[PDB]
Structure formats: C-alpha cells, structure tokens
C-alpha cells in the first residue's frame, strides 16, 4: 500500500543473475518397502498389576457356634406368705 512518488517513480523489476535453475528443483525421494522387524511376543511380564486395588480394608467375619447349653442350680426365692 505504498504511495507512488510522481517526482521519482521507478519501473518494474529487471532481470538479474540467477541461481542455476536445476539446483532449485529437488528430487522426489524414492521410498523403499519396510517392515516392523521380528516376531512379537504375545504377552509381557509387567512390573505392575493390571487390576484394581482397595483404598481401605474392611473387617471380615465368620460365624461360630457356642456349645451345648446346660442347666443350672438357681438360688430359689422364698414363699410369698405375705412377707414380700
């Protein structure tokens, strides 16, 4: 967006020496076929386990029984003959 100087104008570009025209043109680089080499193993001996863990520990229980329940020799009360 330059302003044209009317007192000192200039013309378009003139030819100048050039950079040997084939040396600015590249070759198209020619890929050969390739292979991810080797026979891959199916599994890996991992350093960490792959499953979930638990944040807190919960107390577990198992039921037990008591035993054969016996009789008893109670201390027996007195007879309510109007004193009680």
């Amino acid at each position: 967006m330059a302003l044209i100087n009317p007192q000192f104008p200039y013309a378009g570009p003139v030819p100048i020496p050039g950079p040997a025209p084939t040396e600015t043109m590249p070759l198209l680089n020619y890929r050969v076929e390739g292979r991810i080499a080797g026979i891959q193993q199916a599994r890996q001996f991992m350093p960490f386990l792959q499953g979930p863990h638990r944040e807190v520990a919960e107390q577990t229980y198992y039921a037990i029984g008591t035993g054969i329940q016996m009789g008893q020799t109670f201390n027996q009360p007195l007879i309510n003959t109007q004193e009680g």
Partner: protein, 50 residues
C-alpha cells in the same frame, strides 16, 4: 498400540571428514537428499592445531 511412523523413522548421528582446503576460498560441503538435518557440527582440525 504403536506409533508406526515414529518407529519406522530413524534418528541418526554420523560424522565425516573433508579435506582439500584452500585459503580464502569457499569450501562447500553439500547436504544430501532424503535426510532432514537437525544439527551440523564442523571441527576445523588445522593440521594438529585448534
């Protein structure tokens, strides 16, 4: 799961040795095709003197 382009591309380190230098004349070492050069290192062994 493999980054297939990253495993097929190599990343290499190579060194060379050019000779036949003339004082005050441009010695040119051309970069070759197919390589994407990341760094150049030039060592001027000036006949056992650095």
């Amino acid at each position: 799961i493999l980054p297939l382009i990253d495993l097929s591309t190599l990343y290499n380190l190579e060194n060379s040795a050019q000779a036949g230098l003339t004082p005050n004349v441009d010695f040119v070492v051309q970069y070759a095709n197919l390589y994407r050069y990341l760094s150049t290192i030039a060592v001027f062994d000036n006949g056992g003197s650095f």
